[PDB]
């Protein structure tokens, strides 16, 4: 393996002492080689206990090194002091960067010394600069200095990659060495006593700078990383938006030669149309003012790149312009104070001189859309609106509530804020009213939360009480169903692939058509959202209170009206210093259940009005209006060909007419491409944002290092597929430090390639990128059962809370409200849902995961001896694999590439077998009980509970079905027709299609039903054993791509799988689960 | 066609605001085909009716 070779040179770099030793640990599937592994590991612990070498021992036990596989590498290091600064002065050659002070409009966001920015010790909030990743700066500088000594002696091409990653390191190292490397605590939080003399934003600058200089490959990358590393030391605020500004304009200049398209039922076609790009002179005057704001900010090598591209305006050099936009978001987050983020957001200027003739049409268009979404589930009395108190409470999001409450659960009292834990307390103390929702007014205001965006100003968010979730769950779950059957709302075009969903932009683009994409400056706190948006919905629930006749569908529709009356005036609770500031804010509340289902109504019903007022001058015929919250486009098809004046006079008539409703906007029109989400259609080729901060998190999580090392790799493979190539030798160096564990003092344990890359709970990174590899060899399926044996752990906090008198009083009050019977297969099935729902609490899931890893250390310091006969996914593929016969085969390049930023070893698969044409849905069949229970009751049972029901008596299935609420003639038509007997073979087959994934980070892009992959896969057909047929044609279609990515060549399989081995595998596929299947092997 | 009574009453107005504005016309009202035409939208005529 390649990763093990990077391990044994990382140890020889960080521990350059003669007192240091490395002890490899080995394991094997053989019972004979295991005793070869026990004796070898014992002797290296006795010989290295008292100063004896290992070169005389590795020859004697060379029967175990070349045959068994590496488990871990133990590290002895009697080094008292970290030698980071001792080898930092070797690279600290350049002049130190002096910070600037006149570049920011605030004081704390400037780059001042922390002694001058915070006067005393007690008012030191690190939450403006905190990287909140579980690594350090001292560990990052060892990850670059390891790379800068391995690639010192290089060939004449790879030297220039090393040289450009060195002059960008002397900018970093000569600034850090001037103030010294900061020393963190054990929680990876930079304290005040170390940051007394260091400049503020030195950790989050040098973390965002090291992420950049491990991505500098070409000279086009070096001019960007030289003018962003120097500048991000000075202005932390304006820099991320000045560079990322013209990419909203530059998407409208490129021509269309041959573009993709998606037809009406969402499937992919290819089109060949040639559409000119028509931009007026007021775009090249708005682009020159976007290139003079980048010259006053100091940077001068970026607008020379753009102005050398504006004379071309060609799609061949647009991968350079998408690279400049993506490097802008890597400067780090824009975190600021909670007071200045709200008070700059909650400040808005309303005006009584707004056009009231346009609001009474905008209110009515919200009225006629809310009625249109609920006219069918209210006229027919639906099973989910009649149970709004229960379906909102039984499926309750457990993220957070407003305040911190002292919850007492039996003996163990806990300070929690989770939302379903507040429901358990108030249902125990009786202070929980089902039909009364609390008023958010000048008394009891709304608390606040924040979300940080890598380039945007820090925004606020609203945390409503839990009684504003039970009132709004059942109605808005009926509005998301209509948003998946309408061509306008963007819950419809939401699939796995991105060419299918955002490819209806280029359906109506021609030379007589004009696309129109507008982004409101702030969708919250607009004038058209305070009064005319609530009173359009309250009117829609007056016409819906006349549609039905129940006392219970009206009552849930008089609660969803009461939450809009109470939010017409609102107050936010934000503290500062010692005073609490209550700010009136009657606008929309980003943070309800309603905040996306009613940002697609209020923005469609707004743009259906502003497209009506511009039709007094230009007569057109609109084709689609797709809307996604704020971000919406609307294609307009004209009579004449679109010229340079119809583009200018529509962009002046959509901007001004939006200003007639006091909504400040910029209105951009083009004919070639838009920027709807961060996914950019440019010239018929979808381009992505590609900015994910590796070494900077927006907030500290509920996860450990072994899980934050997986999201460092998962944020890299998304960064690589989207066009931002970070060096794999740096990501692998950063996994060998995060997965480090200190057993005792001066002893670190490092797992090998087989512990991290195997398919289990403890997975960090794949061996070769973009592909999953299920290792079918006997030394690798044997360790998968060793890791699948300890994943089932119990946490003592979740079992002290599950046996309390409060949690049992919540399940028994929820089981009594649901079922009007006695049965305990639901009370034992509801209580297993809220025990699973309490994993969102932080010390519960941390004591789950720490009991996973601390039990892994007992497995890694010794050779593994755990032998078990469990059927895994990796045991199915050991029986299929010897019956494949490979043969080399040639396959031409037919289809066109649609994403130019993809890597070369992925783009060659797309050019040969094609991008995905349609989203494959092969999930078998749902059982006939779950179509009978989910249609009457709102209780969705797990499929391991519906198998437990079927294996009961005939008279105990009928008692269970009548228990939920099913009538007697419907259960007796179920049970009497013996279709409970057929559902044994549809539950057990539902775990086969769940098993293997045709979607991944990379596998979504390809077409798996292509007529060029079906030509290479040559498998003979057997009529029976249907479960085996699926897993043969899926594993064969995955084995060719997993070979054609690694080596760039195509192979053609042949699986003459015999009839005697299919029936042995048919019972292996039905015995993965832990339930009684009728057909077993032995 | 159901809007008849309020549309007999529009052309009585459209040909009265023409009829008494034409009395304030001293220049000769010659009618020939001009080069550039002032464009009228039929989506703006379905608003007046």
């Amino acid at each position: 393996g390649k990763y093990n070779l990077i391990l044994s040179e990382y140890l020889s770099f960080i521990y350059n002492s003669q007192s240091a030793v490395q002890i490899p640990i080995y394991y094997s599937s053989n019972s004979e080689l295991e005793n070869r592994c026990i004796e070898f590991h014992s002797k290296c612990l006795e010989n290295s206990k008292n100063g004896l070498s290992l070169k005389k021992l590795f020859v004697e036990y060379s029967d175990v090194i070349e045959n068994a596989t590496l488990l871990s590498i133990l590290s002895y290091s009697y080094d008292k002091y970290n030698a980071v600064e001792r080898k930092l002065v070797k690279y600290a050659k350049g002049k130190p960067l002096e910070a600037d002070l006149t570049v920011n409009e605030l004081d704390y966001e400037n780059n001042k010394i922390t002694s001058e920015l915070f006067p005393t010790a007690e008012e030191y909030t690190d939450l403006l600069m905190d990287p909140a990743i579980l690594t350090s700066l001292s560990s990052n500088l060892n990850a670059v200095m390891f790379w800068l000594e391995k690639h010192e002696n290089d060939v004449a091409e790879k030297l220039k990659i090393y040289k450009r990653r060195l002059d960008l390191f002397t900018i970093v190292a000569s600034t850090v060495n001037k103030y010294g490397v900061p020393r963190h605590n054990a929680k990876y939080r930079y304290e005040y006593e170390v940051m007394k003399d260091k400049p503020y934003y030195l950790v989050t600058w040098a973390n965002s700078s090291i992420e950049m200089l491990m991505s500098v490959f070409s000279h086009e990358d070096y001019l960007i990383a030289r003018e962003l590393i120097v500048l991000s030391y000075s202005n932390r605020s304006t820099l991320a938006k000045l560079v990322s500004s013209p990419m909203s304009i530059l998407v409208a200049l490129v021509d269309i030669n041959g573009t993709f398209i998606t037809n009406e039922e969402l499937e992919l076609e290819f089109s060949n149309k040639y559409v000119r790009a028509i931009v007026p002179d007021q775009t090249f005057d708005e682009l020159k003012q976007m290139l003079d704001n980048m010259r006053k900010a100091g940077l001068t090598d970026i607008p020379k790149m753009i102005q050398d591209w504006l004379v071309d305006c060609s799609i061949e050099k647009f991968p350079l312009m998408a690279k400049i936009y993506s490097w802008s978001f890597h400067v780090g987050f824009r975190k600021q104070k909670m007071l200045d983020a709200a008070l700059d957001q909650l400040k808005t200027e309303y005006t009584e001189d707004v056009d009231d003739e346009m609001y009474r049409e905008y209110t009515m268009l919200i009225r006629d859309e809310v009625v249109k979404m609920l006219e069918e589930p209210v006229k027919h009395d639906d099973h989910l609106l009649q149970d709004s108190e229960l379906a909102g409470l039984l499926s309750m999001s457990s993220a957070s509530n407003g305040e911190s409450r002292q919850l007492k659960f039996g003996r163990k009292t806990i300070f929690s804020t989770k939302k379903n834990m507040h429901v358990m307390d108030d249902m125990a103390n009786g202070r929980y009213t089902p039909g009364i929702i609390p008023p958010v007014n000048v008394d009891k205001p709304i608390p606040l939360g924040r979300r940080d965006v890598p380039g945007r100003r820090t925004r606020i968010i609203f945390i409503l009480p839990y009684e504003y979730f039970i009132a709004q769950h059942a109605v808005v779950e009926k509005m998301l169903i209509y948003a998946k059957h309408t061509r306008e709302y963007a819950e419809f075009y939401s699939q796995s692939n991105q060419l299918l969903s955002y490819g209806d932009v280029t359906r109506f683009l021609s030379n007589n058509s004009m696309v129109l994409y507008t982004d409101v400056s702030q969708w919250d706190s607009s004038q058209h959202n305070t009064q005319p948006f609530r009173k359009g919905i309250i009117m829609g629930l007056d016409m819906l209170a006349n549609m039905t006749n129940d006392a219970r569908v009206i009552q849930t529709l008089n609660l969803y009206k009461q939450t809009q009356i109470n939010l017409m005036d609102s107050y936010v609770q934000i503290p500062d210093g010692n005073v609490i500031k209550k700010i009136q804010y009657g606008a929309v509340a980003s943070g309800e259940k309603q905040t996306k289902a009613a940002n697609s109504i209020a923005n469609l019903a707004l743009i259906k009005t502003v497209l009506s007022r511009i039709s007094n001058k230009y007569s057109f015929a609109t084709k689609i209006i797709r809307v996604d919250g704020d971000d919406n486009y609307a294609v307009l098809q004209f009579n004449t060909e679109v010229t340079k004046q119809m583009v200018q006079d529509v962009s002046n008539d959509v901007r001004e007419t939006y200003a007639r409703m006091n909504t400040k906007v910029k209105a951009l029109v083009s004919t070639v491409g838009i920027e709807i989400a961060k996914r950019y259609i440019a010239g018929g080729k979808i381009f992505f944002r590609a900015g994910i901060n590796l070494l900077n998190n927006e907030k500290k999580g509920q996860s450990t290092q072994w899980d934050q090392a997986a999201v460092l790799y998962s944020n890299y493979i998304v960064n690589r597929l989207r066009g931002f190539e970070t060096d794999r030798e740096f990501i692998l160096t950063k996994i060998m430090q995060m997965t480090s564990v200190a057993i005792t003092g001066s002893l670190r344990l490092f797992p090998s390639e087989r512990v991290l890359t195997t398919n289990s709970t403890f997975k960090v990174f794949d061996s070769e990128d973009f592909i999953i590899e299920y290792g079918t060899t006997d030394d690798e399926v044997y360790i998968q059962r060793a890791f699948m044996s300890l994943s089932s752990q119990k946490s003592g906090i979740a079992d002290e809370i599950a046996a309390s008198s409060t949690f049992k009083n919540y399940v028994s009050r929820l089981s009594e409200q649901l079922l009007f019977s006695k049965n305990n297969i639901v009370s034992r099935g509801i209580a297993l849902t809220e025990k699973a729902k309490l994993n969102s609490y932080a010390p519960i899931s941390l004591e789950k995961r720490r009991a996973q890893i601390s039990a892994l250390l007992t497995m890694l310091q010794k050779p593994v001896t755990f032998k078990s006969s469990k059927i895994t996914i990796n045991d199915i593929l050991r029986d299929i694999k010897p019956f494949f016969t490979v043969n080399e085969a040639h396959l031409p390049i037919q289809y066109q590439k649609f994403m130019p930023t993809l890597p070369d070893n992925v783009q060659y698969i797309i050019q040969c077998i094609g991008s995905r044409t349609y989203q494959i849905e092969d999930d078998g069949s749902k059982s006939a009980i779950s179509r009978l229970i989910s249609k009457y009751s709102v209780y969705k049972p797990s499929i391991e509970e519906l198998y437990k029901v079927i294996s009961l008596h005939e008279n105990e299935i009928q008692l269970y079905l009548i228990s939920l609420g099913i009538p007697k003639i419907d259960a007796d038509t179920y049970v009497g027709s013996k279709i409970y007997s057929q559902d044994k073979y549809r539950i057990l087959e539902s775990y086969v299609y769940n098993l293997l994934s045709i979607n991944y980070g990379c596998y979504q892009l390809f077409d798996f039903n292509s007529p060029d992959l079906e030509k290479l896969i040559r498998i003979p057909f057997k009529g029976k054993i249907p479960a085996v047929t699926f897993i043969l044609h899926l594993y064969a279609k995955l084995e060719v791509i997993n070979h054609a990515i690694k080596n760039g060549s195509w192979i053609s399989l042949f699986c003459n799988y015999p009839k005697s081995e299919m029936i042995k595998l048919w019972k292996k596929m039905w015995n993965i689960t832990s339930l009684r299947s009728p057909y077993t092997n032995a | 066609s159901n809007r008849l009574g309020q549309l007999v009453d529009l052309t009585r107005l459209l040909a009265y605001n023409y009829e008494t504005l034409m009395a304030c016309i001293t220049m000769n009202m010659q009618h020939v085909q001009t080069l550039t035409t002032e464009k009228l939208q039929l989506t703006s005529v379905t608003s007046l009716c």
Binding site: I278, F284, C313, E641, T643, K644 | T36
Partner: peptide, 15 residues
């Protein structure tokens, strides 16, 4: 600045 459209240039020879 891009080349002008053929429609906008030929209302301008008229105008």
């Amino acid at each position: 600045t891009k080349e002008e459209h053929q429609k906008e240039v030929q209302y301008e020879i008229l105008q």
